[PDB]
Write a protein that binds this ligand. Structure first.
Ligand SMILES: O=C1COc2ccc(N3C[C@H](CCNC[C@H]4Cc5cccc(Cl)c5C4)OC3=O)nc2N1
Ligand SMILES: [Cl-]
Ligand SMILES: [Cl-]
Ligand SMILES: [Cl-]
Ligand SMILES: [Mn+2]
Ligand SMILES: [Mn+2]
Ligand SMILES: [Mn+2]
Lengths: 670, 671
DNA sequence: AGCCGTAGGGCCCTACGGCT
DNA sequence: AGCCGTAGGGCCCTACGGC
């Protein structure tokens, strides 16, 4: 909805395009309303390079810009009717605002190309460090970005019409592989030429989606939003032994500290982590309505509560023992983990699916006993083959159970990273009395919506697209579990109906495996052994660093305790020394001198409470020291022999297998 | 919408009504889907005692119920066509769920009475402690509420049709005064008869809105949502000196801790406190788009940042010195203040508007300097008249400045608590060249939406209801301020046009004063002096309790200093005593009997660190003891003489006036 | 009239890749 | 063709009282 300017001389009038009304309100308050109109849009606009033509012309946003510009489109473009001589793209200073700019330019170039050639399209430059313009105060948006006296608008120029053509089709067109080859050749881990602006802005968007949004890290199997939710729960001590915490608090916590994005993305990613039909090993324990297999969303975040599951403690275990590198957060006010310790193989256990740019990923979940057995075998034989690994890891193990048809799709996916896996419901034919039968479905394929699949069966029966079905009911319940009943007409073959259902409904569904994950911060198609080799290497690194951290801290503490033991052994001299010093600093110097102490030891002596001089407190000091010396010698044994450290890796993985390993759910049928 | 059950036999089928899809999901997952259908609604349902039939019949929620029930309505009702023989009202277990229940009952009583008389209407009893059914797990909603083996449904009974009629008309009808009377007459601060159910659930709703939602407390000027926000900022140290904090963290924090309601009510309440066109003395310091006078909303909470203003530190000043009573929060997991110390008279300074039940409140804002001089005059003269307080407090002072026409409406509002005050835009007539003129408006009345005012004027011009306006523009800008231009046709009398605009548009707007506030937890219409009296009596209690807290605290400390003095004087024997003690208890027991020490004194000695034995601490400890003793008598002098306590209140008020007092913005012109 | 301000409640558009 | 899941972006109904 346009906020027009009062002047009607197009030569001096500017229209700014902003992402929405949050951004529009700061822009309206700061503008010069005589000459500066504002059109807030609605986020991502239609990609006209990919869209059917009738659909573009019906698009509400497309239509409001055409109307606003007054020019018309395509053949009917009349540049003499433009209502503004500066069209100013002013999206947010983040990667999504870069994307929206590339979509806006695609539309101008494909439908209002003379606007560009006439020098009418500009790119505003609002400062970085604000999530959107709505975060800026009006006078700041004026002085930095909109005031003609200070701003630095870039004018879009079209130099090479053929290169611009090709550019728009490669970046914005539907041939993914040309977009993908552009990203790989260019990935890096005033006036403005449109080709160049399109390239740099789309690459800026595409790389961010690839390494910091849609794909999981090979080491902990997490995407950034999930890693930040799980770190946020741990920062707040939201452990299984504590009471549930309001989901609104959690989301608001994670958004402000670590994840500068919309609340629905954070909340709905936390939700998936609590759903036992989505996560093979759920990472979040939800209290309340957390959605169903029928596609119902969760309850609004003001109602639900959450904490960590017990297995999530294994993801976070030893995160504060210098086991993983922390990084600066998005605004330099917080620290966050680049990766979680991940003391079970979470990428394969829970799987992943993510639509990135130029590529996607689709990793099925696995049984945790089999995975760790697989890692165990790899650790005892670096040259193990994929086939040997499949003796441990039979194939996927979906939270929703069901059946897998055959093994060659599994084997291809594990050997190459790509493969097609036919999944089936668990369905039986059974008698219902009076000579009649029914088909009874008790498990359905992974990621299939049950209500949607039932409606698809009702549509087929209604439209006479399948014969033999008299009735269709969902009898699922907490007491029953999943139970879908399809009653068969008397004397009709119910095996033929079922096989037809497998052909015409999601009762059979394929899972296309496409195992892409971040390896060393780069997207990579990996096979099964590589995924396990990267995980095992992470675990050797974590436990080595935890050992190195534990040894430093123990030695420091022992060093302190040696000072307290000296003080307990010479308590009268300690008192005399301190009492005869004017100041704490003279005391600290004199203690260092008399008793050969370090500064840290002297300050520990000065900080000791008189209660530490009682009998049982002196014994406590001696006991902690003796215990610490034994602990130090054990830690040093581990760092001195790579084999002992590798054996500690296997032992802690075996402990996790025994505590959290469960039975396989999906049956793999020959 | 409707998740129907599979049985088509009505006598065994039940339909549960819940507030929405969040509640519906838990209900749908817990139900027995053979006999239990579910219809989520959309929150507050239409009050059909107040609405006419055309609106009712086209309301989406009402239609869905009628279709689902199958019986038709009114004279078309047919009990034989009921698709269920149990209609179960299962709203959330909170006062707004009680309200929705009264609304649904009203609809059944007025359109489907034979359903009640057949005993087909029931009330479910989900357990308390959940914000909505969407917080329960599926299985616990089944076992507590839906399972026929353990549930306690209430069958709605109609026992006297004359009493029911009158009850529905009184509680839900148009006339407000009968509703207000029922609340006043009744407020206290497995089958169910419908009149009892309607009176109980409605009174619960009404009392909760009256005393814990829409009306300000007379002492600190705040409604519960605003108090909890501001307390929330203070408990997280979001002070003016610290950086801004993310609005979403604040809102999520306040909702979990103290305010179990929608995030839109929390965020919008914080937003208004940050608007210098809404608050005469803004309590929240906002970062980003916090809305405008055109009725633009604030940026969404994921974009904005907030902290306290400096004047808000005065609302919170002394909150940690036992000056106000803390209470348990909604779930018993937290403590929250019942009232803030409010070291400036914030009820009148910032005003309030609120719609409650059976009553509303409209308090206009005032100039801080005038208010405090008012309170000061009062404190010197309990018998002071309203005319004399108006020598200090001339009338409201809107953040939007503007003009007030005359004093008679102000005077009536201050004497009785009610009165109409005419607000006028600041408007001049000026030349624009070529012999033509214009009207220029630079200030609009309080709470008038500028863009809406402009389009009303434009509407009068295009509908030829006002002569002589040729053009109209909004030239407002950050550099210019508010500036609306109205061009006048050449030769037209721009003063006639102006006067017509005051008549026909919000350019002139009334403020209807209705000073209702909470006095001792009860709503009360109060005049200006009573409002000032209650505030001053608050300031006396706060300063007296603060003084008593510092006295208690200073005496505990001097006591500790006396025990440490003794230790430092016998430090060798203190150390030995301790060293030969196996446990801290034996040490405690020994120190007390040897040096005549209390438990806390001997605990302080055992807690003392070694660095405290340096040779100037004894004098440093003696130094603090003798100032503390000077400090204890200063405090005791205040508590011994009420005139001194009163003078201390005046002194701290005068200093607040000097630091935050500012000039009057609204001009009162005579009438 | 419809607006003030705390409350109850929810829906739909867009991009992106790969499988059907 | 339209589904999967992280992302960008917003709008409407209801109660309540006084004018
Ligand atoms: O308690 C907390 C904690 O952390 C938070 C972070 C962030 C946000 N939020 C919420 C809000 C966006 C969600 N509602 C948008 C409405 C627009 C619209 C239009 C038509 C139909 C519908 Cl249904 C809707 C829904 O914007 C924002 O930033 N809230 C919270 N709350
Ligand atoms: Cl300590
Ligand atoms: Cl304090
Ligand atoms: Cl208005
Ligand atoms: Mn944005
Ligand atoms: Mn509710
Ligand atoms: Mn008027």
């Amino acid at each position: 909805k346009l906020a027009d300017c009062s002047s009607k001389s197009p030569e001096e009038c500017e229209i700014f395009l902003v992402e929405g009304d949050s951004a529009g309100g700061s822009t309206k308050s700061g503008r010069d309303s005589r000459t500066q109109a504002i059109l807030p849009l609605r986020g991502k606009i239609l990609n006209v390079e990919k869209a059917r033509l009738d659909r573009i012309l019906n698009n509400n946003e497309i239509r409001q810009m055409i109307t606003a510009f007054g020019t018309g489109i395509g053949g009917d473009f009349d540049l003499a009717k433009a209502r503004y001589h500066k069209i100013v793209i002013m999206t947010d200073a983040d990667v999504d605002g870069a994307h929206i700019r590339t979509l806006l330019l695609t539309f101008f170039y494909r439908f209002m190309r003379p606007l560009i050639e006439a020098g009418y399209v500009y790119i505003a430059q609002p400062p970085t460090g604000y999530k959107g313009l709505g975060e800026m105060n009006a006078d700041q948006l004026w002085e930095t970005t909109m005031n003609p006296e200070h701003r630095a608008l870039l004018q879009v120029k079209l130099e090479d019409a053929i290169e611009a053509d090709q550019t728009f089709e490669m970046l914005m067109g539907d041939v993914v592989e040309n977009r993908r080859q552009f990203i790989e050749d260019n990935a890096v881990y005033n006036e403005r030429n449109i080709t160049s602006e399109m390239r740099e802005s789309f690459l800026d968007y595409a790389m961010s989606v690839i390494v910091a949004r849609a794909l999981p890290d090979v080491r902990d199997g997490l995407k950034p939003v999930h890693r930040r939710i799980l770190y946020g729960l741990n920062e707040q001590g939201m452990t299984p032994d504590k009471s549930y915490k309001k989901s609104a608090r959690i989301v608001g916590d994670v958004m402000g500290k670590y994840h500068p994005h919309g609340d629905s993305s954070i909340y709905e990613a936390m939700v998936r982590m609590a759903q036992d039909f989505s996560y093979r090993y759920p990472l979040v324990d939800g209290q309340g309505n957390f959605g169903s297999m029928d596609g119902d969303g969760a309850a609004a975040m003001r109602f639900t509560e959450a904490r960590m599951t017990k297995i999530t403690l294994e993801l976070l275990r030893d995160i504060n023992k210098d086991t993983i590198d922390f990084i600066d957060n998005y605004d330099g006010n917080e620290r966050e983990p680049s990766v979680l310790p991940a003391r079970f193989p979470n990428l394969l256990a829970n799987g992943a699916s993510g639509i990135a740019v130029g590529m996607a990923t689709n990793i099925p979940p696995h049984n945790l006993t089999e995975l760790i057995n697989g890692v165990l075998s790899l650790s005892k034989n670096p040259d193990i083959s994929i086939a040997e690994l499949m003796e441990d890891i039979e194939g996927p193990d979906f939270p929703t159970a069901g059946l897998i048809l055959g093994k060659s799709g599994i084997r291809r996916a594990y050997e190459t990273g790509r493969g097609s896996i036919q999944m089936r419901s668990r369905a039986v034919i059974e008698e219902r009395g009076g000579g009649r039968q029914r088909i009874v479905v008790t498990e359905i394929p992974f990621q299939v919506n049950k209500a949607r699949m039932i409606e698809k069966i009702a549509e087929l029966v209604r439209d006479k697209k399948i014969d033999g079905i008299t009735d269709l009911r969902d009898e699922t319940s907490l007491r029953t579990g999943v139970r879908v009943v399809i009653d068969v007409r008397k004397d009709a073959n119910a095996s033929v109906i079922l096989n037809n259902l497998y052909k015409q409904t999601p009762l059979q569904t394929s899972f296309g495996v496409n195992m892409i994950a971040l390896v060393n911060g780069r997207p990579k198609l990996i096979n099964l052994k590589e995924a396990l080799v990267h995980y095992l290497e992470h675990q050797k690194t974590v436990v080595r660093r935890r050992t190195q951290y534990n040894l430093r801290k123990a030695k420091d503490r022992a060093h302190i305790l040696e000072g307290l033991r000296i003080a307990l052994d010479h308590i009268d001299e300690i008192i005399s020394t301190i009492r005869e010093s004017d100041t704490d600093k003279v005391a600290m110097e004199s203690l260092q001198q008399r008793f050969k102490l370090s500064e840290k030891q002297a300050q520990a002596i000065l900080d000791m409470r008189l209660r530490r001089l009682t009998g049982l407190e002196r014994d406590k000091i001696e006991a902690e020291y003796n215990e610490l010396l034994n602990y130090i010698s054990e830690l040093e044994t581990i760092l001195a022999d790579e084999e002992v450290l590798l054996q500690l890796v296997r032992d802690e993985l075996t402990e996790i297998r025994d505590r959290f390993g469960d039975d396989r759910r999906t049956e793999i049928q020959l």
